[PDB]
């Protein structure tokens, strides 16, 4: 998992591009959803 | 003894010297050939003071326009941030103060934020004066140093003054 990239900063997944870190995001660390 | 943690961002416009600066203070070291960051890169490192142990959880952001929106994920709950410009580039400097403006009004409250100028060593094609940059930071309670990531200077003391700063 490379310490650099679209890495989530709350679990530090890594995702592929920026659209699937805010996708990602979005569904499981913001206020439940949305 | 004791150990405190801090997330801390970094900030500011393309090519000014971020990733330089951090991995200077993380490892000791400096390319002159280092790529640009693509989204956002983690590091840590720890400074010592007054018998406490001060963990830095960093991310080192991309500064290209296109990854604006992405900073507010990276500086959520950062309690520290370096916003970087370069001393040779006064529109890195506007495009700082602008971090600096973000910072106030969408960051945590107590962030700690310090503006370094870097590429000081360069200072022979200085384009921002020192005391215009002071002037700003002194108006705005920013630790102000300026840097450079290349031959080392000021890279230990502005993460050593944000340490003294935060609360601990
Ligand atoms: N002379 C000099 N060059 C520096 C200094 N700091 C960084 N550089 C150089 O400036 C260029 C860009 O540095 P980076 O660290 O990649 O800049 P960055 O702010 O991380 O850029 P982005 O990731 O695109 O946002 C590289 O060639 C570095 O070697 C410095 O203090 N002095
Ligand atoms: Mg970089
Ligand atoms: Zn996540």
């Known amino acids: 998992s490379s310490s650099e990239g679209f890495i989530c900063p709350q679990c530090m997944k890594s995702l592929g591009s920026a659209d699937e870190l805010f996708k990602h995001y979005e569904a499981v660390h913001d206020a439940g959803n949305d | ?168």
Request: aromatic residues 10%.
């Open chain 2, 1 to 168: 003894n004791k150990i405190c943690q801090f997330k801390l961002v970094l900030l500011g416009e393309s090519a000014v010297g971020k990733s330089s600066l951090v991995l200077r203070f993380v490892k000791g070291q400096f390319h002159e050939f280092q790529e640009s960051t693509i989204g956002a890169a983690f590091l840590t490192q720890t400074v010592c003071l007054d018998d406490t142990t001060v963990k830095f959880e960093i991310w080192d952001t991309a500064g290209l326009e296109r990854y604006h929106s992405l900073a507010p994920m990276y500086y959520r709950g950062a309690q520290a941030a370096i916003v970087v410009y370069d001393i040779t580039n006064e529109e890195s400097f506007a495009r700082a103060k602008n971090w600096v403006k973000e910072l106030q009004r969408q960051a945590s409250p107590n962030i700690v934020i310090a503006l370094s100028g870097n590429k000081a060593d360069l200072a022979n094609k200085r384009a921002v004066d020192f005391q215009e940059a002071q002037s700003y930071a002194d108006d705005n309670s920013l630790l102000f140093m300026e840097t450079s990531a290349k031959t080392s200077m000021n890279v230990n003391e502005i993460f050593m003054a944000i340490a003294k700063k935060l609360p601990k």
